[PDB]
Amino acid sequence: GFKQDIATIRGDLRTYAQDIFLAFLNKYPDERRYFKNYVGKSDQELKSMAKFGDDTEKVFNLMMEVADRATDCVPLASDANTLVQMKQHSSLTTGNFEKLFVALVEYMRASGQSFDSQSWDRFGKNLVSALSSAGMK
Amino acid sequence: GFKQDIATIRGDLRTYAQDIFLAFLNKYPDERRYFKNYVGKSDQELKSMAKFGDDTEKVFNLMMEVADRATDCVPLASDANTLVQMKQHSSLTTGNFEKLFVALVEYMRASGQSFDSQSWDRFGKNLVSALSSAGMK
Numbered sequence: 001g002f003k004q005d006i007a008t009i010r011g012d013l014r015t016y017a018q019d020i021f022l023a024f025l026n027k028y029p030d031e032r033r034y035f036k037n038y039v040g041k042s043d044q045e046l047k048s049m050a051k052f053g054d055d056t057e058k059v060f061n062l063m064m065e066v067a068d069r070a071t072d073c074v075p076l077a078s079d080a081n082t083l084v085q086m087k088q089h090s091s092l093t094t095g096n097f098e099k100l101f102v103a104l105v106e107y108m109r110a111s112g113q114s115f116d117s118q119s120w121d122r123f124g125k126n127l128v129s130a131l132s133s134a135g136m137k
Numbered sequence: 138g139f140k141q142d143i144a145t146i147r148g149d150l151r152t153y154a155q156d157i158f159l160a161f162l163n164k165y166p167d168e169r170r171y172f173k174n175y176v177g178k179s180d181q182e183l184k185s186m187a188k189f190g191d192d193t194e195k196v197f198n199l200m201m202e203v204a205d206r207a208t209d210c211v212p213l214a215s216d217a218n219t220l221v222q223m224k225q226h227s228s229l230t231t232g233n234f235e236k237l238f239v240a241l242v243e244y245m246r247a248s249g250q251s252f253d254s255q256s257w258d259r260f261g262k263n264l265v266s267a268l269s270s271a272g273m274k
């Protein structure tokens with residue numbers, strides 16, 4: 001279930017974080033614009049930038065922390081608040097997050113690893129709702 | 138995105154090259170008049186024509202290099218000059234290339250693989266513009 005998925009992802013965070021982020025960018029190529037440094041680089045090329053592996057892991061580490069602190073896939077208001085107030089997220093809207101979760105769930109469904117994909121869909125939905133409440137456009 | 142798509146195509150080039158060129162010929166059957174002995178044949182007949190596979194592979198080998206040498210989907214002027222000055226391209230105009238890229242983009246959108254189709258559309262347009270600049274009518 002959801003709890004085990006957090007363990008699965010944490011167990012090999014570098015791989016999962018990189019592969020899910022790439023699935024996001026590949027499904028929604030216009031989102032690459034937010035990451036100027038990743039423009040004009042292939043999937044295999046990106047893994048060689050110290051920043052890429054390190055920065056993607058940091059993103060998915062926090063995602064896992066928000067996921068683990070949730071109750072029944074409902075994130076804490078304080079965690080939603082953190083995500084909105086973050087300076088690196090100043091120009092984002094809830095749609096950016098919606099797209100990430102659509103790509104994340106699609107990745108899980110396509111994988112050979114057994115994920116509670118329905119739960120991640122619901123978590124994504126609840127997070128987006130909590131993000132709007134914390135003032136994200 | 139675009140740079141990954143190049144790697145994707147290169148990973149199974151002959152298959153992609155034949156399937157995209159076939160999509161082109163089937164969308165624009167009168168375009169066969171630039172080629173020798175393609176008329177009167179089904180897709181499978183063409184894929185068993187030794188020259189068809191060899192030549193179509195060579196077209197896409199070069200197209201991938203032109204894409205790879207590009208910056209932000211803008212090809213090198215010298216790459217465009219080569220395509221204009223090639224003896225095998227003496228009967229061509231920019232509309233021939235426009236048609237090829239319409240078909241390629243349509244193929245990418247229809248495929249189950251995550252191509253950045255909009256970028257290929259831009260690449261096609263920028264290449265046509267560069268062909269024009271290099272003297273193609």
Ligand code: HEM
Pocket residue numbers: 031034035036055058059060062063066083088089092096097100
């Ligand atoms: C639940 C989902 C998300 C979490 C947990 C999260 C978390 C983070 C974290 C921890 C960082 C700092 C990483 C570091 O530099 O150490 C960061 C930065 C950043 N975030 Fe997010 N984020 C999320 C969603 C998104 C989305 C959907 C976008 C837009 C596509 C986005 C855009 C950015 C950008 C552009 C940076 C700066 C990093 C860079 O560009 O190099 N984030 N985020």
Ligand code: HEM
Pocket residue numbers: 168171172173191192193195196197199200203220225226229233234237
């Ligand atoms: C970016 C697009 C294109 C690239 C990179 C390209 C490149 C090439 C290359 C490398 C060859 C040599 C093939 C060989 O001899 O093995 C070739 C030949 C040829 N090209 Fe193109 N070409 C492009 C577009 C087109 C288009 C749109 C047409 C016609 C609608 C066309 C018509 C031909 C013909 C008739 C030949 C020689 C005979 C044949 O290969 O069947 N090309 N081209």
Ligand SMILES: Oc1ccc(Br)cc1
Pocket residue numbers: 021055056059100
């Ligand atoms: O650096 C980043 C990696 C992944 C996301 Br999602 C956002 C920022």
Ligand SMILES: Oc1ccc(Br)cc1
Pocket residue numbers: 158192193194196237
């Ligand atoms: O021989 C050729 C194969 C494919 C194209 Br497109 C053009 C020429």
